[PDB]
């Protein structure tokens, strides 16, 4: 590891600096280094890890979608087929994306998840596991597409089971998990009715628990609830 010589606290500090500077690849590298120190992550540190990798993979996903669209348009009878370059470059970006997902999944497997015993930590990491299998699913076409989809489903389901037992329905981790699992159902699993049902039940059960929250917690929960509502509006 290129970060093995740097102090854990220095890596975390530099991740925060990288975030300010909008240097998300650096941020991710610093947070990978921090994880590889072998200690459990705090809430704030888990968020740093997530922000970093979400930004990196988000850029890759956006690029892949642009290239895939150009490729699909190129592979038709209308304009012109301009040789192997679009496919080659889409494949390059795809492979880089898959690599990032593999890196995150690797951190989760070695050994964030197995050491995570509190509900907040375990659900957070299982949600992440679902998310990065979902990103793999977005680009999968081969023999393993089904298995990738099932891996995402299984991670999300384990997270859901823990979240329903251990967290209130307004907990932002529980809400974000349900949001993402609902996106999985709609966009990946071809199960829009499951997506809609999950989003609606999640929204309604959260609504009923808002009365228990402080002003600040209310803001946190309702912001995610809005996203559930936005998807329901799109889907229905």
């Amino acid at each position: 590891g290129a970060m093995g010589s740097m102090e854990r606290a220095s890596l975390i500090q530099k991740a925060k600096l990288a975030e300010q500077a909008e240097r998300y690849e650096d941020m991710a590298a610093f947070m990978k280094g921090a994880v590889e120190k072998g200690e459990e992550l705090s809430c704030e540190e888990r968020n740093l890890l997530s922000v970093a990798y979400k930004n990196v993979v988000g850029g890759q996903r956006a690029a892949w979608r642009v290239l895939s669209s150009i490729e699909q348009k190129s592979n038709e009878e209308g304009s012109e087929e301009k040789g192997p370059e679009v496919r080659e470059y889409r494949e390059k970006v795809e492979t880089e994306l898959q690599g990032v997902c593999d890196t995150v999944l690797g951190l989760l497997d070695s050994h964030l998840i197995k050491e995570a015993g509190d509900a907040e930590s375990r659900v957070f990491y299982l949600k992440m596991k679902g998310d990065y299998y979902r990103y793999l699913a977005e680009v999968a076409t081969g023999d393993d597409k089904k298995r990738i989809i099932d891996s995402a489903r299984s991670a999300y389901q384990e997270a859901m089971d823990i979240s329903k037992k251990e967290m209130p329905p307004t907990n932002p981790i529980r809400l974000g998990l349900a949001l993402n699992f609902s996106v999985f159902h709609y966009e990946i699993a071809n199960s829009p009715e499951e997506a809609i049902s999950l989003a609606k039940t999640t929204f309604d059960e959260a609504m009923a628990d808002l009365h228990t929250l402080s002003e600040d917690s209310y803001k946190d929960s309702t912001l995610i609830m809005q996203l559930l509502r936005d998807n329901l509006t799109l889907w229905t």
Binding site: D131, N180, S182, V183, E187, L227, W235
Partner: peptide
Amino acid sequence: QRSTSTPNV
């Protein structure tokens, strides 16, 4: 239009 997942901020 694509569904919205949990954002960073």
